[PDB]
Paper text:
As a model β-strand mediated PPI, we use the GKAP/SHANK-PDZ50 which, plays a role in the organization of synaptic protein complexes and has been linked to several neuronal disorders. There are >250 [name] domains with several therapeutically relevant proteins known to exhibit their function through a [name] mediated interaction. Class I [name] domains bind to consensus sequences with a Thr/Ser in the -2 position from the C-terminus, with the C-terminus hydrophobic residue and free carboxylate being the main determinants of affinity. Here, we used dynamic ligation screening to identify peptide-fragment hybrids linked through an acylhydrazone bond, that are able to functionally mimic a β-strand and inhibit its PPI using GKAP/[name] [name] as a model interaction.
Interestingly, the most potent hybrids formed from 3 and 4 contained the same carboxylic acid functionalized aromatic aldehyde fragments (A047 and A048), indicating that these types of fragments might play an important role in binding. In all hybrids, the hydrazone bond existed in an E configuration with the aromatic ring of the fragment co-planar with the hydrazone. Interestingly, hybrids with the C3 linker (compound 4 hydrazones) showed more favourable enthalpic contributions and slightly higher affinity in comparison to compounds having the C2 linker (compound 3) when the same fragment was attached. This indicated that the more flexible linker allows for a better orientation of the fragment leading to a more favourable enthalpy of binding, but also increases the entropic cost of binding, leading only to a moderate difference in the overall binding energy. Moreover, the replacement of the N terminal EAQ amino acids of GKAP to completely non-peptidic motifs resulted in similar GE values indicating this strategy can also provide molecules that are less peptidic in nature, while keeping the original potency of the native ligand. It is worth noting that although compound 4-161 possessed the highest binding affinity, the aldehyde fragment in compounds 4-A048 or 4-A144 have slightly higher group efficiencies and may therefore represent equally reasonable starting points for further optimization. Although this leads to slight uncertainty about the exact location of the fragments, we hypothesize that the key carboxylic acid moiety moves dynamically across a positively charged patch formed by R679, R736 and R743 on the protein surface, making transient charge-reinforced hydrogen-bonding and cation–π interactions which is also consistent with a more favourable entropy of interaction.
Numbering used by the authors: 651 to 682, 689 to 759
The structure:
Amino acid sequence: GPLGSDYIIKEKTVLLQKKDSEGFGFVLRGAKEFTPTPAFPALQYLESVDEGGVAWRAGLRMGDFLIEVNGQNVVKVGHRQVVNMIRQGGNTLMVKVVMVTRH
Ligand SMILES: *C(=O)CCCC(=O)N/N=C/c1ccc(C(=O)O)cc1
């Protein structure tokens, strides 16, 4: 608006169940105490998502920011620690993300 940026923020929580011989189908990237902002809500985001893969079919998309992994908040958690948390769940991953559109 005239006084500042307007955004739509969509939260998505999904259950990923994969097979032993595949990945969840996404590439995680760390952007950098940290204070979340609308434009920058979390440290880790989906740099890419394999179209038709497990993560895609559940509704995850490139650019989604990761908020929680398996009931633990990861908004302020570094890249290697989040990767490890995801691998701890094996073939199951419950994740909450936020998608942000800026105008
Ligand atoms: C995971 O694969 C998603 C992106 C991760 C990534 O881009 N890692 N790159 C790391 C890296 C570390 C050091 C250098 C360097 O100093 O030359 C470059 C890239």
